[PDB]
Amino acid sequence: MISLIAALAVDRVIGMENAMPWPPLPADLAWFKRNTLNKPVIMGRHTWESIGRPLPGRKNIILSSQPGTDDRVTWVKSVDEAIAACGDVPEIMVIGGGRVYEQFLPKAQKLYLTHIDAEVEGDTHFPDYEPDDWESVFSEFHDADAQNAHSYCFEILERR
Ligand SMILES: NC(=O)c1ccc[n+]([C@@H]2O[C@H](COP(=O)([O-])OP(=O)(O)OC[C@H]3O[C@@H](n4cnc5c(N)ncnc54)[C@H](OP(=O)(O)O)[C@@H]3O)[C@@H](O)[C@H]2O)c1
Ligand SMILES: Nc1nc(=O)c2nc(CNc3ccc(C(=O)N[C@@H](CCC(=O)O)C(=O)O)cc3)cnc2[nH]1
């Protein structure tokens, strides 16, 4: 089973200049770690270059059309291969970026979304999807506080 996890600002903005255009929200980073630990993660090369190091406790799988440049991770040249390299596991986590999210969306059964109340400019967006394909089953909104500079809402959607 394939899931996508992402944090989205207003208008589905997810990135700018290959970074994330808001301040780190530690509540959202904890949520990300909580929901990806001990699972395989699949990410595009540009996202790999943004994170800058293997996420620990996870099987890191990078998509690129070009041979790999780091043997701490697992490189693959196509979507099918990326799924194949995860093995027989309960849940594969796709961690972006925009182009990778768009390819995995039709295969996904679960979206893990953080809705952040920030109004920033971006160059990368989360893919358009069809609201009638999905069912919202968890929703948790929190206000901003001393550690988290925007209000945010965790949501999980399951494919109907
Ligand atoms: N807010 C969030 O939750 C979040 C999460 C993740 C990323 N981001 C942001 O998203 C942005 C990056 O997104 P992006 O769309 O530019 O890049 P991306 O999707 O992360 O990476 C695209 C790259 O992945 C490779 N790739 C994708 N599909 C492939 C396929 N089917 N076969 C072989 N290779 C494939 C290609 O690498 P090659 O060029 O080497 O062939 C490619 O150009 C950054 O700003 C990042 O910070 C935000
Ligand atoms: N919900 C969500 N939030 C994000 O920040 C996010 N970011 C990406 C890609 N960017 C990154 C950047 C940093 C880390 C990261 O440092 N995670 C560490 C610790 C985070 C922390 O210090 O709190 C980890 O171990 O998971 C992960 C993904 C993909 N999906 C996301 N999904």
Side-chain angles (χ1 to χ4, degrees):
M1 192 196 77
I2 293 164
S3 300
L4 279 57
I5 182 161
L8 274 62
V10 170
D11 276 324
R12 314 202 316 273
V13 167
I14 65 169
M16 182 70 163
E17 299 287 346
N18 202 29
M20 276 160 303
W22 45 83
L25 274 61
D28 185 43
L29 287 169
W31 158 269
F32 175 87
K33 198 174 181 181
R34 220 186 69 187
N35 287 316
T36 61
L37 198 58
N38 299 312
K39 299 179 193 174
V41 294
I42 302 164
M43 70 190 106
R45 178 184 52 87
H46 287 129
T47 294
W48 160 247
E49 297 186 19
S50 74
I51 292 180
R53 54 205 75 168
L55 296 161
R58 281 149 284 191
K59 186 175 186 171
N60 286 233
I61 294 166
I62 323 297
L63 272 163
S64 174
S65 65
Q66 307 144 12
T69 54
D70 192 321
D71 281 335
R72 296 175 292 167
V73 307
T74 298
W75 295 90
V76 303
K77 288 192 173 191
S78 68
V79 164
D80 290 327
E81 189 184 3
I83 287 172
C86 295
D88 192 338
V89 297
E91 184 172 26
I92 293 170
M93 306 297 294
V94 169
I95 73 150
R99 288 157 65 198
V100 165
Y101 287 136
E102 164 187 312
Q103 290 168 96
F104 278 92
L105 171 68
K107 302 184 170 297
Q109 304 304 313
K110 195 171 181 177
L111 301 176
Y112 296 75
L113 310 174
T114 307
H115 304 285
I116 300 174
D117 290 316
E119 295 181 355
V120 294
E121 290 279 17
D123 59 24
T124 321
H125 298 78
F126 191 84
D128 197 13
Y129 70 83
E130 165 60 51
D132 293 351
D133 277 348
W134 301 94
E135 176 175 357
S136 173
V137 295
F138 179 80
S139 190
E140 196 176 271
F141 176 81
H142 301 266
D143 296 272
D145 63 27
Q147 294 178 45
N148 297 279
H150 302 282
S151 52
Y152 53 99
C153 178
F154 300 136
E155 187 176 24
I156 290 173
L157 295 158
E158 295 185 350
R159 188 182 289 273
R160 288 195 171 104

